[PDB]
Symmetry: C5
Subunit: 336 residues, 5 copies
């Protein structure tokens, strides 16, 4: 009773050329693509790449695979995949893509009576996601995923998403978990590209990433904020304590300097200033300005002591207000 | 006398199709799985992955492999594995799995007269273990291991553990050794998942991890604890020693700042506060508060010296008690 | 209607030897090469290598592949690539080159009636780009890309660019994006090399890189500049404040020392001085010189106080002017 | 005259089944193993693994390979290795093992008239070496190397070392060179293991490693020792110099704190204290105790100056003696 | 006219056994080896390995490949390489060697009428270069490159360099470029090794490396030199400035301590002292000695001030002279 299936498979492969696409010279091959994201891999800001594991599925029609039998479907595995024609789908932005081969090559092949073919493949794509870190860390990124045929132009093979956008791309509930990003949603699109080898249709999927803040607050902002407050303590010490107030200014200035270096160690070596850089720069000004106030005060503490006390007394109020005021503008500007 | 074995193997492969599962269109294929963990690989908290080396064994029934001979069993190797049908088992959460091929592909194949087949394979799985580091380092993790068929739905292939849970999964005595985790135990479960390609049965194995503390005590807590004690020494110095007490406060505050940065370098860049972070924050408050006490004392050391001495004298007792009291609450809360 | 294509392909391969180049012993095989750079990978200054992803295309004439049919072209895939002769093109400067195999080997093969063959391949080349970091970071680099035949000398196989230089090499608009380099343009050239195995023609492509400054300004120059300004503040303090002015000089000198170490951590370990190194060295002299001025002033503050005040007063003006003057010369020299 | 060899090889493979072990169902296959260690690779303490490159040789008897000819031996290469039966030897503790394939697969095959077979293979094994770092760096490690059959139990295949232990395992004179270990010697053993798949014989080789000290002396101990001596200098300064003695105590305490952090950066993150940790802890006590002495002295320098001088004078002698005494006990205890 | 070549190749392979070396049982196979180093890869001091890319060429005589035709030579590619016998050459010291496969396997095969065969292969060898870092950084290294047959002893296969030493090994002009080494020259040698499997001839190539200094001068020596000079500035300050001179001594001592730690971070963790270590140790003595001078001076500044001034005045001259004198001896000793 099982030998019947063997006869069907042998019959289909008989007089079958896998080097020729279905409907060659008669029509245009149409491929339906659906994607399921098992896990949205880590996003490497330094390398401008993001890893992703998906179950890529393609569907098309091949009249050469029509068959008649008790079962309307023929579940199979990778063994028969190489014996038939499959699209040469590839990822344009994929810097390095590898498959999964354990325990068995993770591929599926199903065939219906009408000749419809389902080809499912598991992939891990290390794609490239260029980013504009001008509003970092209050930045939103749109990492794309482009794929299409390598050898068959639009005139021969066309890719189209199946059903609506929601069914076209699906992300696992636990897969969309990252340490420094929120997966707001996904979008799908298409576009034709003209090349020296002809026109090709491109299927594009974009993932909306909203960076989650809180790591940089504990790592960069808070040390900068508390460092500024530490400098302002010098305003409450007597002028004659030259050495004491010198330690506050010098130590704080160096502390802010190393924080800027440390902050950008993890950040990509971009040749432009970010929002965090401006915040550090302003904080650097406050600590440096406090030291200048002490130097100016200590320079005139003899000739005109009266103004020296007023400046020191006034500075106790002005500096905290300006720094507090700056934060409201800074946070409101980038959080709105 | 040895040629008889050759005839049996040749006979079994004659008229044998490896593209068809046993009992196709007649019943549901049942697979029994047993796992032995040779060594529980390192757990990468930063990458939320854990490596594991196992001897994965699958058992099923294939009536096409029945034979009669002097021996009831036919020990073999990987040579015949590709000549017969094997399940397309794969790991859903396996980010990257590779086999061992030296000296010979580490696979075993045994066949009995009744047609029962044993297929053993050695694997190294780099699975993903999402973690909730809210109670870190007093956190317990449950790293799973999910596997199942890729192409054969529940209606065709079903996986079930063999014997009891203890025999189903086994961990070597020396294998369960990690630098920062205790392998409390293992659990096994099953569940059906509905997909666009049909329903699939999933075999799940969970490993209970109890983080072992002592590295962070020597690396993070103790430096923080001793740093706080160092700051409190300033309370025992005379007020007029402005520079001396300034060094204690400034140096300690910066020391705590760098400890927080250093502590999170190894820790994953999670966007939320951990138990260790709160401990550091409280320790930061004590050192910062001590400096504020000195500044306040030095500010009123002229107008009202009487209160200045009382505050300094009182602070010698209050600060150690509060810090000691906090530790009891902190340790008891997270250790109970 | 589709079986006709099968007959053509079978006919071409009949009596076809892929071990022999077309026109062997009758003429010289001519290959036309065109390159499209999908993305100019990162440039590793430390390893003197740059990654690049290209769609390498080769065109040549093979009279053995002539055919007659309704279609003037035969789009195909990698399946037939191994069944015919292709040039043994390789990259001389490619330290490690790997192909892309997912979902299908990214190769294309097209054949015309006249026998013209188009062979397109996707590659990721980790080539070597030696650099002369004498004007770093104001340095311009010319990273080459050399390729040619491995076994067929100039007398048998010759490579020539197709059409003009612009069409010969093309770079994607978004591909030419780097964090620390600007892709000014590309150039193409040729040259014959004499070897023990014969003369070979070499096709060379050079990419002009103009390093973009701004990361080192925020990371190295500014901390050095502000550190120097910090030292000059000591000139505005009274001489009797020995400890206060000592902190400025000592802290600044050490700060500059660690900046030099930190700056070269990312920079390659080249055994010669760069422009940035000279800038740091000069900045180190200013901070060190300021400390020497204080030591000299403090040494003569008793015997001849009159000159001590003049030196301290004069130093307040001389030092800022010289440092400001140096920057104009430094920046103008390397930016012109 | 050379065609005779071709006939012999063709004859042996005729009617030969590589899926069946020699002497199947008639006796037990006996395998003789000899190992030569070309180079003992680096030992990764952090990953608890050690690399090793060996020329693994196996010898066994196969009556099916008997032949008669002018030559008593048939040197060969990897070409015939896959055409005959070879044991499925694998390394139980090998986390990742790979072969060498350049220029040609590094394998040898020799056959004698009697049917004896020699199979030599070159391997690079990244095995796991669990370590007990309780006496670190005065610790001795015993890294094992376990291998055996994967599919053939003890009842079918048995491994035994050839000749004595010295000939069984050999290490190259220059191979046994490590930066932080001495290869004292090697030992070989055997043991039977019972599994669900049957009993298997295990061949075990242990390498005795004696860690060589001198890097940690220059990196950890000496900075700690000199730091303690630096703190004791404060005892020779006058009490009224409050700021001066404060710098010694504060700087030394922080210096010891960072040394402990730095020391464990390279060391594995083990959750227990090592001998080096105790040495650092004691050194931390001395520096911290010195600061406490100054604080206590400065606290009573007014009411009872007489005792203050005695304590400071006495401390100059007590502290060096105790620290010197501790070293003798510490070094003697762990070096004996 | 091209079919003639096909007949020749088919004829040669007819009745050809690739498992047998040429001249088997009749003479000894002689192989001529020539090497061209395209680029001398980076030298990893930490891992004691150096990468190298070469075009390895082997020449030998095979009477079975004699042919008659219009052309005296048959240029070919890797396609025919596997169809004939090639030596099993391998690198004894090669820890990991991989080939280049893009665009086509980089191999060449040429055959003459007499039967002479040329086999050229491109390789990237990560060999091991043990080093004696006793004179580091004034050290000269001799990195070898050993290769020979794996299965064919000296009695069957013998390797000999072709022509003179200069032609035997060739290094590209631009290939011999390293950041911290000078490629002085190359030497070639031979030697027979006795093994359990027989005697084998070994072809050895040594590369003379002269480390180029200048990176460590800017990274280690200069900071140490300037740090010592900074300490000597304390001798020019008044004794009563206890805090001021304390900062110089304490800061300098710690600065030297961290420099030693930083210097060895890149250096391999060798368990012995290098020349740089001695230089740092001496520099550490000068800074530490200066602090001791201040402590001794401050201890006797009351009882016998006269000697205190003399010591401080004398130290201003003695210390610079000794440090300057030491450098001349140090540099002359290791540079001569
Ligand atoms: C020389 C060559 O030979 N065969 C091909 C080729 C063409 C199309 C294929 F599908 C496969 C291969 C080529 C390159 O031709 C291209 C390809 C893409 C684009 C293009 O528009 N983009 C670059 C990729 S992208 O950034 O994803 C979107 C923008 C421009 N020219
Ligand atoms: C597009 C597509 O084509 N073939 C498949 C497919 C289905 C089942 C297979 F066994 C193999 C392949 C798919 C994806 O369909 C899925 C798969 C799993 C889940 C699911 O429930 N989970 C995701 C994996 S998980 O996190 O381990 C548990 C939760 C949801 N949809
Ligand atoms: C021993 C050997 O056997 N077959 C070959 C060989 C020759 C040419 C091939 F195309 C392939 C292989 C060799 C090396 O012969 C060479 C090769 C290149 C150069 C040369 O001029 N350069 C080195 C590469 S480069 O830096 O890109 C440009 C400068 C000098 N000698
Ligand atoms: C489920 C399964 O299926 N086939 C096998 C299997 C058995 C023996 C083989 F030689 C190959 C494969 C298994 C695991 O069975 C084992 C294996 C080893 C040990 C054991 O005693 N140790 C673990 C490895 S160890 O740490 O080196 C020494 C201690 C215990 N149970
Ligand atoms: C057990 C075994 O079975 N077949 C072999 C074998 C022998 C020779 C081969 F050419 C290939 C394989 C072996 C090891 O036998 C050896 C090999 C080399 C040396 C030796 O003298 N040295 C080690 C390599 S070295 O450091 O480069 C120079 C010093 C000593 N014994
Ligand atoms: C691509 O080409 C097809 C040709 O039928 C056309 O229908 C489609 O609208 C084109 N897509 C775009 C985005 O222009
Ligand atoms: C999965 O489906 C099978 C169908 O027989 C059922 O017996 C089993 O209970 C299901 N498992 C779960 C967890 O629902
Ligand atoms: C290389 O050789 C060919 C031989 O025809 C010659 O035409 C060409 O000019 C040569 N190229 C160079 C750069 O000399
Ligand atoms: C292993 O089993 C064999 C069976 O013959 C026995 O001879 C040998 O002593 C056993 N080894 C050990 C260590 O028990
Ligand atoms: C190696 O053996 C051969 C045998 O002919 C001999 O000629 C040669 O001199 C030997 N080489 C050395 C270095 O002893």
């Amino acid at each position: 009773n099982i030998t019947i299936f063997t006869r069907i498979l042998d019959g289909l492969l008989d007089g079958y050329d896998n080097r020729l696409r279905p409907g060659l010279g008669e029509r245009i091959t149409q491929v339906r693509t659906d994607m399921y994201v098992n896990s949205f891999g880590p996003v490497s800001d330094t390398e401008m790449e993001y890893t992703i594991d998906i179950f890529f599925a393609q569907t098309w029609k091949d009249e050469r695979l029509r068959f008649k039998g008790p079962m309307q479907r023929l579940p199979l595995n990778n063994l028969l995949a190489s014996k038939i024609w499959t699209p040469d789908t590839f990822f344009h932005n994929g810097k390095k893509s590898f498959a999964h081969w354990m325990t068995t090559p993770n591929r599926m092949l199903r065939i219906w009576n009408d000749g419809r073919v389902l080809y499912t493949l598991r992939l891990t794509i290390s794609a490239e996601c260029p980013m504009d870190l001008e509003d970092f860390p209050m930045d939103e990124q749109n990492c794309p995923l482009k794929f299409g045929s390598y050898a068959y132009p639009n005139s021969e093979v066309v890719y189209v998403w199946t059903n609506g956008s929601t069914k076209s791309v699906v992300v696992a509930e636990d897969g969309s978990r990252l340490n420094q990003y929120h997966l707001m949603g996904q979008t799908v699109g298409t576009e034709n590209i003209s090349t020296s080898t002809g026109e090709y249709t491109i299927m594009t999927a974009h993932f909306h990433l909203k960076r989650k803040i809180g790591y940089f607050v504990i790592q960069t902002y808070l040390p900068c904020i508390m460092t500024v407050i530490l400098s302002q303590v010098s305003f409450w010490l007597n002028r004659e304590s030259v050495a004491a107030r010198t330690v506050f200014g010098v130590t704080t200035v160096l502390t802010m300097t190393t924080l800027s270096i440390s902050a950008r160690n993890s950040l990509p070596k971009v040749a432009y200033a970010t929002a965090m850089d401006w915040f550090i720069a302003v904080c650097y000004a406050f600590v440096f300005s406090a030291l200048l106030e002490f130097a100016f005060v200590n320079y005139i503490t003899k000739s005109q002591p009266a103004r020296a006390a007023k400046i020191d007394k006034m500075s106790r109020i002005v500096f905290p207000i300006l720094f507090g005021t700056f934060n409201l503008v800074y946070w409101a500007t980038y959080l709105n």
